[PDB]
């Protein structure tokens, strides 16, 4: 096996910037014969298959923006993206297409830094359709914020909080570089129908005031 070393493995740039990830191999990918390196670069956007970027160490595949360039030969290759843009958010693999087994390198995630945005919040009561079955799930959606670090607190009725809470972050938006998260408190219809003022309130670096969508009801 021929190992491919990729670094850094995370890149955080502001876009409009110029970047260079590297990728060395433990063995030469260069023929002694045609003189061409058998190294490819693939871009993998969040939730899509990989797509050809550069082949040879340097040929840019038709349709790829001229922002992307790669150099090197033998063992140390690089990929420069000349003016980072919000779509560029992906993992970039380099691969040995020299011989078997073909190997890949760890990857290098490119994340975009942007100016702080603040969350829009929403509280959606548990559904009737669902009550009528045991559970009652209150979903809180926090949209379009940056940075991503955001704590969310669920004070059921009085002041409360717990391990009956699921939280999920979205990937970086490839349009604004903002995140989203949904936070879901799922208790029992009984349990549910005990208290009745249900709140959600995030504490984001943007504002100081804990941000808090709330709702009271449950008798109904």
């Amino acid at each position: 096996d021929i190992v491919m070393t990729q670094s850094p493995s995370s890149l955080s740039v502001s876009a409009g910037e110029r970047v260079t990830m590297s990728c060395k191999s433990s063995q030469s990918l260069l023929n002694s014969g045609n003189q061409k390196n058998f190294l490819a670069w693939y871009q993998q956007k969040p939730g899509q298959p990989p797509k050809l970027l550069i082949y040879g160490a340097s040929t840019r595949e038709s349709g790829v923006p001229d922002r992307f360039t790669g150099s090197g030969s033998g063992t140390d290759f690089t990929l420069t993206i000349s003016s980072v843009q919000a779509e560029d958010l992906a993992v970039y693999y380099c691969q040995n297409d020299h011989s078997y087994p073909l190997t890949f390198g760890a990857g290098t995630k490119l994340e975009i830094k942007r100016a702080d945005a603040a969350p829009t919040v929403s509280i959606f009561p548990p559904s009737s359709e669902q009550l009528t079955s045991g559970g009652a799930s209150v979903v809180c959606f926090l949209n379009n914020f940056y940075p991503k670090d955001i704590n969310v607190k669920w004070k059921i009725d009085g002041s409360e909080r717990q391990n009956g809470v699921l939280n999920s972050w979205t990937d970086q938006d490839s349009k604004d570089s903002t995140y989203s998260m949904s936070s879901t408190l799922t208790l029992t219809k009984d349990e549910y129908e005990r208290h009745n003022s249900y709140t959600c309130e995030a504490t984001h670096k943007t504002s100081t005031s804990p941000i808090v969508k709330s709702f009271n009801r449950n008798e109904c």
Binding site: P50, T103, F104, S122, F141, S168, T170
Partner: protein, 222 residues
Amino acid sequence: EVKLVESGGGLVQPGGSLRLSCATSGFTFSDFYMEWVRQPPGKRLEWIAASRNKGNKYTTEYSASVKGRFIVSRDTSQSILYLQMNALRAEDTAIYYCARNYYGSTWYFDVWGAGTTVTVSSESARNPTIYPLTLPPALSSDPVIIGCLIHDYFPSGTMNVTWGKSGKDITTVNFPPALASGGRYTMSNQLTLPAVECPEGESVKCSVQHDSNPVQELDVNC
């Protein structure tokens, strides 16, 4: 016209089998190398079998991870590349892709498939139960916000969620699945849209497509 489509995937128990297939069209299959690549959940692309052009006898090659349990073959008349997977273990849970290993100057993978998810688990299938996410017209400030909670299902595999609505103003956010209490998942999917695009007594259908199975759908009232 160079297209690759792979199918055959979902749950299988430790010790079971799957036959993954990759429908290849738009080119002369009979003489391009076809390759299988997997992607475990928080990990690099890892390469597994390889077929060869009816050019030097459809020879194969397997990675150590799989040499002995996986078997690669092709239905040359039909233009399908197969991956017989015997003796799965949890370790094999990944998105599996077929790729064309093109050769001109150099070798490279010019076309990849979309993937197919194989979860190797002892657990068992629970289809989601889609619940509507709407707000009492005492909560909508316009734009309206609607969603579907896709709830308590197994495996996670892959979930495509679509709305019976699109255009200019109308965003969809699909949140990744989260493991709850049970060893089962939940996801949500919200659709925000011009309030005059989701008035009343109307409704927009949210469609979930999970791994390998039939579409499942709900109509959520605005």
